[PDB]
Amino acid sequence: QIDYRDVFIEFLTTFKGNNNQNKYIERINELVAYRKKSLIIEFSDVLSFNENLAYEIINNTKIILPILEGALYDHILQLDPTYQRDIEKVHVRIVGIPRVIELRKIRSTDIGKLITIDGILVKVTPVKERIYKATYKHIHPDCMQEFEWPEDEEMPEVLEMPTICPKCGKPGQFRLIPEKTKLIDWQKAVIQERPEEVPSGQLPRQLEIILEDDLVDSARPGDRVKVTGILDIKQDSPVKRGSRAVFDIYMKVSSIEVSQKVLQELEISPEEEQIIKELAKRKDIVDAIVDSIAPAIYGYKEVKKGIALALFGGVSRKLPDGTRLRGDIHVLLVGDPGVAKSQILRYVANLAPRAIYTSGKSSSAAGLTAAAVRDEFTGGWVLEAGALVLADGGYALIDELDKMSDRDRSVIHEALEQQTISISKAGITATLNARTTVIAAANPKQGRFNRMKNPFEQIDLPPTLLSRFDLIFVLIDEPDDKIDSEVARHILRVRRGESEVVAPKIPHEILRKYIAYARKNIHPVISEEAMEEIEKYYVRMRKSPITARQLEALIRLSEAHARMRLSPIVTREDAREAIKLMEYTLKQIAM
Amino acid sequence: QIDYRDVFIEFLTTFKGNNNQNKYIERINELVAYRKKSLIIEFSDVLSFNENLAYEIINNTKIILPILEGALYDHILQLDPTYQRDIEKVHVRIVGIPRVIELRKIRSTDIGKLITIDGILVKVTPVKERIYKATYKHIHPDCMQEFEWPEDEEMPEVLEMPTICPKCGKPGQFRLIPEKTKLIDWQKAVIQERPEEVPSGQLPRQLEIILEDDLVDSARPGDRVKVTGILDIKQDSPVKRGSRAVFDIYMKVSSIEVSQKVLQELEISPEEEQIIKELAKRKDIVDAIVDSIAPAIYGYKEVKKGIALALFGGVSRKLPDGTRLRGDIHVLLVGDPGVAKSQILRYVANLAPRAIYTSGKSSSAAGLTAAAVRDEFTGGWVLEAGALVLADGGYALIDELDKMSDRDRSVIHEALEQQTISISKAGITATLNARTTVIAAANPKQGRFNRMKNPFEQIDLPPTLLSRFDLIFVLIDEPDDKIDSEVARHILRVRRGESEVVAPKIPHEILRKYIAYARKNIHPVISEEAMEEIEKYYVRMRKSPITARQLEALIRLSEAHARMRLSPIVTREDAREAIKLMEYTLKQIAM
Ligand SMILES: Nc1ncnc2c1ncn2[C@@H]1O[C@H](COP(=O)(O)OP(=O)(O)O)[C@@H](O)[C@H]1O
Ligand SMILES: Nc1ncnc2c1ncn2[C@@H]1O[C@H](COP(=O)(O)OP(=O)(O)O)[C@@H](O)[C@H]1O
Ligand SMILES: [Cl-]
Ligand SMILES: [Cl-]
Ligand SMILES: [Cl-]
Ligand SMILES: [Cl-]
Ligand SMILES: [Cl-]
Ligand SMILES: [Cl-]
Ligand SMILES: [Mg+2]
Ligand SMILES: [Mg+2]
Ligand SMILES: [Zn+2]
Ligand SMILES: [Zn+2]
């Protein structure tokens, strides 16, 4: 950490304008005299005064700005303590700040200007050296003198020689002198689009960037970075023809920092915020939701409640004392073929605000996780995001998880538990966030597993994976004349076109907004009561087989129930509900 | 959306002819004075007045045309309200719209003209920049000046710098000045023939196309597109003779849009249409059709009825509430060695208007589905279409399905259920329509399975696949003296050269025409009576096994039957007949 508060104040009080006037001393004065609450700062001014500050404003905008406003405020109360009786705070507005362009939208209108790109590094060359001023010796018996070539002019990226010795005037052989030539650190790197911004199966576009001097080695392959610089056009075969008058685009980096991915939340309407605030009050809230989850289905009151809790999720707090505590809850539905599994998933996607519906079988290399791929056209490797990476921060409804890739099975455990996926290929080592909630459907290898034989050996999924699902609903279909009829009826109605009173009790769009608010602003805290009940339940159920991992889920489900409750506090009623669901699942395994 | 209605009217009221006259104001006036019902518009005129409209007419002809006609009509009733007592509608005719050429038929007579090709994108280069107008500096101590090069002339594709400085007149070294040079976005892409238009196992031809400025990135690899532009010739190695004076052909794009595949229907002569209604009123129509399916075989009344319903298909309806509903019905014939399966398929192929008879094993990489293949001569990948993709919108009579590729088993579930096949290879990700009805034959792993052993395990196809066939006819051949005798006769007869007595009971040609009509115009609506019968049956058959999948099939078969009725309303008779067959197939399992 460094103090940008003094450079900022120093910049305001000493920067010089077109007429050697203190541009900002005067602007701060008017602001005072007219009781204004914003100071308009030009980016180029700061950039020219102190590059470090300029870039801190670009790379750490959200943290640095509030500090600068505070420093400006204190500075103002110093000029006039009275300002405070009229204004509580000041706003600094930086105009002229480099546009943020998505890598794949770079056009000719951007060449020559200062912009900023977001991406991931996939290649770095070793540090080399560039000549920005040479010294040649005119090997000639009458001459043999030396001189700095590009006179009053930096050498070109292409290397140019002196046709006519400027010391002797006569041509000849020029033998570059290294000892007296000046050098600058150079490094070529390649950055690709952020995996999340690329359509499944598609190759992520790439861009060449040049780091020089102090920027050399600011990052390593596999790093997510924010690069700011000027784009220009180049050619591998310079100043000559070749195939045309077509040029490649590359950036001359000015600043580069490793960054963190920023999920973009959904717009909250204070109108909606209260609307939701209203439903929360409602008493049959918990049940409407479950009943709104997937109407085009008869019953499954419990199964629907599972999905419901999954959508809201648990605490999800990662802290020092005990590192990461995952709040996302995963739900798996194993069942007899034709029991609506593959169906129910698809239905939730239609409710999906931030989801991805996909199956255990993929046609893309990434699949359900991620992977490094080779790009024939560029010859370099790149990272492609599978479903869990694309679904980060959201939901990933996985169907036929039974038929999942070999590559997927390997890294699958990491994504569900660690909530990340690490990739190592070529010189690339990157860790992508897979903070996503999972709801998958699975079938037993041969078909109905209803046979007294255990349910889990019948499914093509290692018991290691199973232990990772907070709730697993073993499903079987036994005909109960009435129920079959019920299902039939339901199906016949759905098949017959429109006119179907199969609408969610609660409103979908309004529910989406419901959940989001629910995951962003509400963070349930464990209750004393819950703690007691669950604890007793745990010993009880174990006295019955169970694992501490189940306990892990228990707490998560409780938190979830409470999040729909938005208390935000857990309550015995909560826990109870949580354990209730959990037991129903266990008696289910008994088939 | 944009409204082309005002631009259109604007074009009519303001366009200017060769003699500054309002060309169209006068054409509209004569149309009025002479009570004409068609306005002739020249494509070139529209194109020169407003490119967006010109291309909307080219890319969205079917939708845009009626709108323009409507707008012209109103413009007309405005000039003369009376025009309406003599004419109801006006037609706009666009003379001069670019011709639509099949990629493989491009010839020298097309170079230089505006045409339109239909294809699928397979490669896209990253966005580059092209100099259309440069700025050059004369590196020379006496000159050192600047100047835009191609004077009054755009820089050519190839880079050409002045031999003699136009400022000083004296030759020397020239240094490009990027900052003062003007750039235009550039992109090279490769388009291939529509998979459907390419013979099995054959490589689809390709074409280089150049996108510039705002056409850059109008699509991605894997996309079906409609490109409009001018073809020209190029040499990868400019101005120098390579191997000969032969040139490649590429297109300079003017317009490119992602398109949808357009199946072309059969032409119903209103005579055939009336004939059709007469046939429909007929008494033994259902049985007529079955007897006409394949007389060259005796019996198999139910099998012939199955095939029959498969051709007419179910409702097939894609809508939001329950997204995609599949109407195509799939039939599978499992049997003993020598029970006539292979023969029957091929016989139904003879009646095939929109079908592809083909075996389970293929010698082509595509096979039954599709696949990305590599082309050695061009070095790029391409998409090839298998039987289900070529048969889209039609039928695919598969024989010996038992013997199918590894790649096939993988993606076939998609084809039968989703009626699509997705492919991901290199930077290509495409989804090809596979809306095709399947009728296959299959043999048991080794032989006769009469054994008490369950039929399906003996045929090499995962139960997952079988569950996708609405009707499966397990066949077995027992002697029963007389019947064998019947077959002998048939075969012996079939050996006579001309016209063995039995043949289509109903006119084949007329039948094809029949089905097509049925499928296009008929859309049977489920019926109350049907609803209850089927429901009561669902519960009944489940009382002794059965699945909801059986339900969605039952409903489709009903619709099909009613479709041959052409009501279009299902009836109690429907379901009844539908379930009748369904039962027969089930009793058949017991072997
Ligand atoms: N309770 C139910 N509510 C609505 N539809 C049901 C229900 N039970 C079964 N179905 C039917 O089951 C069908 C889906 O079966 P499916 O989920 O594809 O089996 P699987 O999961 O093994 O692939 C749907 O078309 C639906 O009509
Ligand atoms: N009902 C039938 N009508 C006409 N021909 C039949 C009939 N049943 C059997 N055949 C004879 O069976 C032969 C075809 O046997 P085939 O279908 O090739 O056995 P598979 O299906 O195992 O390959 C034909 O040449 C045909 O003469
Ligand atoms: Cl921006
Ligand atoms: Cl800008
Ligand atoms: Cl990330
Ligand atoms: Cl045409
Ligand atoms: Cl022409
Ligand atoms: Cl298609
Ligand atoms: Mg399924
Ligand atoms: Mg055969
Ligand atoms: Zn010299
Ligand atoms: Zn000159």
Residue numbers in the entry:
A (entry chain A), B (entry chain B): 7 to 269, 1257 to 1361, 1729 to 1904, 1919 to 1965
Give the exact sentences the study uses for this entry:
Hexameric MCM rings act as the replicative DNA helicase, encircling the leading strand DNA template at the replication fork. Mcm2-7 complexes are loaded to encircle double-stranded DNA (dsDNA) via a ‘gate’ between Mcm2 and Mcm5 to yield a double hexamer that does not unwind DNA. During helicase activation, the Dbf4-dependent Cdc7 kinase (DDK) and cyclin-dependent kinases (CDKs) drive recruitment of Cdc45 and the GINS complex. These factors stimulate the Mcm2-7 ATPase and helicase and with Mcm2-7 form the CMG complex (Cdc45-Mcm2-7-GINS), the active replicative helicase. Following activation, two Mcm2-7 helicases encircle single-stranded DNA (ssDNA) and translocate independently, 3ʹ→5ʹ, on the leading strand DNA template with the ATPase domain leading.
We identified a chimera of the N-terminal domain of Sulfolobus solfataricus (Sso) and the AAA+ domain of PfMCM, Sso-PfMCM with a robust DNA unwinding activity. The N-terminal domain of SsoMCM (residues 1–269, top sequence) was fused to the AAA+ domain of PfMCM (starting at residue 257, bottom sequence) to yield the chimera (middle sequence). The Sso-PfMCM hexamer forms a ring with a channel large enough to accommodate double-stranded DNA (dsDNA) (see ‘Materials and methods’). The two-tiered structure is consistent with electron microscopy studies. The N-terminal tier has three subdomains, A–C with the A-subdomains in a different orientation (see below) than observed previously. The A-subdomains of Sso-PfMCM are rotated 150° compared to those in SsoMCMN. In Sso-PfMCM, the change correlates with a conformer change in P104 at the junction of the A/C-subdomains. The h2i creates a DNA-binding pocket at the MSSB where ssDNA was observed previously. In each subunit of our Sso-PfMCM hexamer crystal structure, residues 198–212 comprise a conserved loop of the OB-fold that projects towards the h2i of the same subunit and the ps1β of an adjacent subunit. The structure reveals a fully conserved glutamine, Q198, of the ACL interacts with the main-chain amide atoms of the h2i. The ATPase active site structurally resembles the ATPase site of the AAA+ helicase E1 (2:04) with Walker-A/B residues of one subunit, and three positively charged residues of the adjacent subunit.
